[PDB]
Amino acid sequence: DFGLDCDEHSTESRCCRYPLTVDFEAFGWDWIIAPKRYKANYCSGECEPRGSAGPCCTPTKMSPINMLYFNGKEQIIYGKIPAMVVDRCGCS
Amino acid sequence: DFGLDCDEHSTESRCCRYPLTVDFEAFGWDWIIAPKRYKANYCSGECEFVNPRGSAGPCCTPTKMSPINMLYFNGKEQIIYGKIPAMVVDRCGCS
């Protein structure tokens, strides 16, 4: 099947996926040209190398984003950065 | 911190650190010279509260991990000696 999606107003106790904007500009990371901002989302809820065996509401599928940024050497980098967007949440 | 250690068959519900041996020789990775076997451990237990991780809910996860040095083949009479990061769980906690 699929993962569950929730808003800030859900009274959902199970492993669910919530919206979240990651703001690089707000972090102050100005070496990042684009994007200044993107939708990352996150996982939260209960479940009835990485060293965790216990079930946990974790991203079960993530997708990359393309970024444009400085290394400060008059060197601008355009790259595909993996695992930046939580597309789906589930337990282990 | 929240560093509890448990052995197997422990009666424990809280976030604890359990033993686990990773055994390259028994697994058959004969290209791995050393270590043949090492203590990796893992985290397990419940966590109460009243970017490429993207998890907010509390979870029993390693709060500290350490590397191991490995000696292995690429099969070209090429033996590689390197520091391999995050291979040993040293401590477990909720965050």
Residue numbers in the entry:
A (entry chain B): 1 to 48, 66 to 109
B (entry chain A): 1 to 50, 65 to 109
From the primary publication:
Growth/differentiation factors 8 and 11 (GDF8/myostatin and GDF11/BMP11, respectively) are two closely related members of the activin/inhibin subclass that share ~90% sequence identity in their mature, C-terminal signaling domains and ~52% identity in their N-terminal prodomains.
Unexpectedly, resolution of the apo-GDF8 structure revealed a unique conformation such that the fingertips of each monomer are positioned proximally in a “closed” conformation compared to the classical distal positioning or “open” conformation observed for many ligands, including structures of FS-bound GDF8 (top). While the structure of apo-GDF8 adopted an unexpected “closed” conformation, a similar conformation has been observed for activin A when in complex with ActRIIB. In both cases, the wrist region is disordered and not resolved in the crystal structure. The extreme “closed” conformation of GDF8 is not entirely unprecedented, as one structure of activin A in complex with ActRIIB showed a similar “closed” configuration. Although these conformations may be a result of the crystallization process, it supports the idea that GDF8 and GDF11 are flexible enough to be trapped in alternate states. Taken together, crystallization of both GDF8 and GDF11 in their apo states reveals intrinsic structural flexibility in these ligands.
